[PDB]
Design a protein around this ligand. Structure first.
Ligand SMILES: [Zn+2]
Lengths: 44, 53, 53, 96, 112
RNA sequence: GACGGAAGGGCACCACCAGGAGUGGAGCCUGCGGCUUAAUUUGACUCAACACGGGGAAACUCACCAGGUCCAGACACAAUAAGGAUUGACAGAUUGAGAGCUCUUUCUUGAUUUUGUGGGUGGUGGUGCAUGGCCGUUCUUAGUUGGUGGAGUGAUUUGUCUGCUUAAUUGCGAUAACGAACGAGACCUUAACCUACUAAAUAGUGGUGCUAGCAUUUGCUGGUUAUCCACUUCUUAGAGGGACUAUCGGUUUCAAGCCGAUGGAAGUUUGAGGCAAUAACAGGUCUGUGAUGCCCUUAGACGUUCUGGGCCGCACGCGCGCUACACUGACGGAGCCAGCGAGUCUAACCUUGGCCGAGAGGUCUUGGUAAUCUUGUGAAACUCCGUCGUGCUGGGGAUAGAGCAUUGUAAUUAUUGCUCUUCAACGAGGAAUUCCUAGUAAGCGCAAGUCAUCAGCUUGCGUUGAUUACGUCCCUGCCCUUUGUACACA
C-alpha cells in the first residue's frame, strides 16, 4: 500500500490558475497544479 | 406460501383486505360545509370533499 | 480511493430490498408494499390484511 | 471516517438545533435529508458518539433513530460553545 | 395526492405497522399495549396505549417531544402536522403485550 | 404404548369398485441425481425432497470462480507527529480499466486519521443435533385433559361405556360414577333466493326532446357521458328476511335418527373454504429476519463494492409439465360471448384514438391515482360456409440458416417477439403409477405473483361441460374395542 514519502518544510511566486493557495512545480517544464486538478502547460 | 422456507406440503395463504367506498352528493351552500367537514371525524374511515362540484 | 463504486441497480431482484428485512428475495411489490413474503405474514394484521377464506 | 471538521461541525450544530436524528441505513446515499452531507458520514459520526459517549441509537425497518441524553448536551456544548438552556426538544420551546 | 386509495390505505396501513414496531422496540420497558392513529384536518394524532406515563411522557413532556421529532423526521411531516398523546392502559392485566414484556424483563433480571 | 400374515365394529377416490382423463412411450420445457468443470454456490431424498426455497440467474440477484479496490478498524490506551500523523490527485507507466490499485515526478491538504494492544462490528461462513419464530407432518381423522369420588401395594384405571345412531367422544341412552374444560359442532368469510325496504349522471332502464336510416299510420333499428322527467326489473352495498330436514308418509324398543314424496332459490354440515385440540418429530428453515447461543474470520477479509465467468455446462437416469400423433381434424374466411384483476407525480404505469408497417413494432395526441379510462379487457375453445381427403399428409413442429424489431450499461452461450426457408421423432405408448363423484373430471383461454425483458410455473376466474359410483374392506392406509407379544430409538 501507499507510504506517502514525507518532505520537510516547503520550500517561486504565486500560482497561475487558482488563488495563492499552492506552489508551481519542479518537472520537465510541465507545471501541473492539483487544487484545480491540472490546467497549465508552459512556465507560468 | 405459508412456510418461510421451501420444505413442506405446498399450502397457500390468501390474506384479503376489504376497502368500502361511499358517495354523497349534497346541494349545500358555503355556510354548512365549514361545520359538517370540521365535525364527523372518525378513526379508520377517511372522508374527502370535492367542493369544486 | 476513487468514487466508491456502485453500478446500475435500477431493476430486477437486486434493485429494491424488503422495507424491513433488507432481503432481495420473495418481495411483495403488490400495492407498493415492498415487504418480503415472510416479514409480510408477521405484519399481516398490522397493515390490515386478515384471512377470511 | 476522515470526515472534514466542517462536515462533522454541521451534524453537531444540527443535533443541537434538533435533539433528534433519523437516518436511513442505506450506505453510499449521495446526500442525507435535512443535513447537506453524505449518509455514511451521519451514520458513523453518530455511531462514533453513541458507542462510547453521549447519544442513544434505535434500529427499526432500515432506519437509525439517534436521541440525545443530558451527558450529550454537556459534552457537545464544550465542543460547540453554548451557554445553557438550549433550543432542542429537551424542554419547552412551543406552547405544548 | 394523487395516490390511489386502493394503495393509499395500505400505505398508511404500513405506517401503523412501522409505528407499532418502532414503539414495541423503544417504549417496551415502560409498558406498551399498541398505538392508535386518528387522521384529522391539519393533524394526525398518534396515541400510545402504554403503562406508567410519568416515564412514557418522560419529564415535562421531554421524551414524548423527542419521540414526536423522531416520528416526524422519519415520514418528513411538518412540525405541528402530527402530535403524540399517551393514553392509560384500560385494565393493564388484559394487555397480553404488557404481560409478555414485563415477564421478558423478569426473565432478563435472573428469575426462575 | 406399539405391532399382528389375530378378531370385531365403522371410515377414506392422497384406498379399492364402476368408469373418466392421464403420466410412464415420442419431441421439447423445467427441477433433481450423475459426469464434467475455474466454478458448474447451496438447502431438501418415501408418504411429509425433485415448476419447492414464492428459486422464470444476462449483470444486480449471489452465496461459487479468476482478479481488483475500499474501510464502513466503534471505542479505550501507547507511540510518530503542526522544524507535519495523515489526505487526495492530472499525466506518462500499470491493468477488464479516466484505477493514483501501485510505481516516477510533487504538489494538495491540517489532527478527522495512521502504526501497535485490548475491545467491537460485519459475515447468503459453520452448527436446524444448541435454540427463537414460523411451517409441514403424525392427523382430515375425532380425539385430549385436570378436580372430587370408586378400583389398584404401584405404574395406572374408571369418568372417556354394552347397544343403536351420527360427518363426528354427534347424540339417545346404559351407568362408580357425578359435575367440567379443550377439540368436533357452533363461529366467520364466501356463492346462490329477495317483482320487499333503503339510494344511485362512477350502474342501468322506460319516457319524452335534437335527430340518423328503413318504412309511410300509427311502426322498426340506432345515435347523442353538459337536453329534461320518472323508477330500481337488471347491477352495486347497507340493514335485514329465508331453512329448521319445513309438511306428509314410512321406518328403529315409534329414542336419538334414517329413508321416500311434496313445497321451496336452496333439503349432502345447502356448495366451498377459513379457524382448528393434547401430545409428538432430535421433520424443514441459522440462505427471510439489527431472531439468536456457541464456533470460525476480522483487511493478502469468509465483510461489501468493481470487471468478467458460472448457476443453463452433457455418455446417462428420474419427477412435475407443454405440444402432438389428426377428419369429433387442420387451414382460410366470417360468426362472435365471459369472469376474477391491476394500473403512473416528480414519477414513465394501464395506455384508448388517428397515422407509418406484412410484421413484431414505431410515431403525434388521449382517458384514467380508477363501478368514470384501458375495458363490453368484444378471451379461446365454440358456431357457420369453404379449402385439404386416410399420406409422417396441408397431422406434428423439433432442430438448423439468414434477416427486422423491442426490453435492457450489456442480448455472444442465440432474452423475447416477428418474417421466409430447413423439416426430425411421434401412427395413442411395456412393466408400473397419478387424480377424480357434478357446474365436479376433462377441454378452453383469461387475469394476478416474480417482471426492465422473459411462463411451457403457480395463485385465482370464468367459458364448454360428460361417462360412471351413490358402494365395500380385496389392496393401501385410518378411528374405537377385544386379544397375543421375548417389541419400547416400539
Ligand atoms: Zn491548481
Amino acid at each position: 500500500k501507499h507510504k506517502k514519502v514525507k518532505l520537510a518544510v516547503l520550500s517561486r511566486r504565486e500560482c497561475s490558475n487558482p488563488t495563492c493557495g499552492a506552489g508551481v512545480f519542479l518537472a520537465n517544464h510541465k507545471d501541473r497544479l492539483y487544487c484545480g486538478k491540472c490546467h497549465s502547460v508552459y512556465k507560468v | 406460501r405459508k412456510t418461510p422456507n421451501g420444505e413442506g406440503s405446498k399450502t397457500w395463504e390468501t390474506y384479503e383486505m376489504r376497502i368500502h367506498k361511499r358517495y354523497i352528493d349534497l346541494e349545500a351552500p358555503v355556510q354548512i360545509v365549514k361545520r359538517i367537514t370540521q365535525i364527523t371525524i372518525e378513526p379508520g374511515v377517511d372522508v374527502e370533499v370535492v367542493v369544486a362540484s | 480511493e476513487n468514487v466508491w463504486f456502485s453500478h446500475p441497480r435500477r431493476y430486477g431482484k437486486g434493485s429494491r430490498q424488503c422495507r424491513v428485512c433488507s432481503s432481495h428475495t420473495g418481495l411483495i411489490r403488490k400495492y407498493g408494499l415492498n415487504i418480503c413474503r415472510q416479514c409480510f405474514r408477521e405484519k399481516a394484521n398490522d397493515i390490515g390484511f386478515n384471512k377470511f377464506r | 471516517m476522515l470526515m472534514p471538521k466542517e462536515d462533522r461541525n454541521k451534524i453537531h450544530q444540527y443535533l443541537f438545533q434538533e435533539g433528534v436524528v433519523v437516518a436511513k441505513k442505506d450506505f453510499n446515499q449521495a446526500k442525507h435529508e435535512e443535513i447537506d452531507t453524505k449518509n455514511l458520514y451521519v451514520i458513523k459520526a453518530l455511531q462514533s458518539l453513541t458507542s462510547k459517549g453521549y447519544v442513544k441509537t434505535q434500529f427499526s425497518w432500515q432506519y437509525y433513530y439517534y436521541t440525545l441524553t443530558e451527558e450529550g448536551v454537556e459534552y457537545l456544548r464544550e465542543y460547540l460553545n453554548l451557554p445553557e438552556h438550549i433550543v432542542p426538544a429537551t424542554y419547552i420551546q412551543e406552547r405544548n | 395526492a394523487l395516490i390511489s386509495k386502493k394503495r393509499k390505505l395500505v400505505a398508511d396501513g404500513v405506517f401503523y405497522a412501522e409505528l407499532n414496531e418502532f414503539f414495541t422496540r423503544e417504549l417496551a420497558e415502560e409498558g406498551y399495549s399498541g398505538v392508535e392513529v386518528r387522521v384529522t384536518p391539519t393533524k394526525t394524532e398518534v396515541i400510545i396505549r402504554a403503562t406508567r406515563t410519568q416515564d412514557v411522557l418522560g419529564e415535562n413532556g421531554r421524551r414524548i417531544n423527542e419521540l414526536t421529532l423522531l416520528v416526524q423526521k422519519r415520514f418528513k411531516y411538518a412540525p405541528g402536522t402530527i402530535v403524540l398523546y399517551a393514553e392509560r392502559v384500560q385494565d393493564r392485566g388484559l394487555s397480553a403485550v404488557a404481560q409478555a414484556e414485563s415477564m421478558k424483563f423478569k426473565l432478563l433480571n435472573g428469575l426462575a
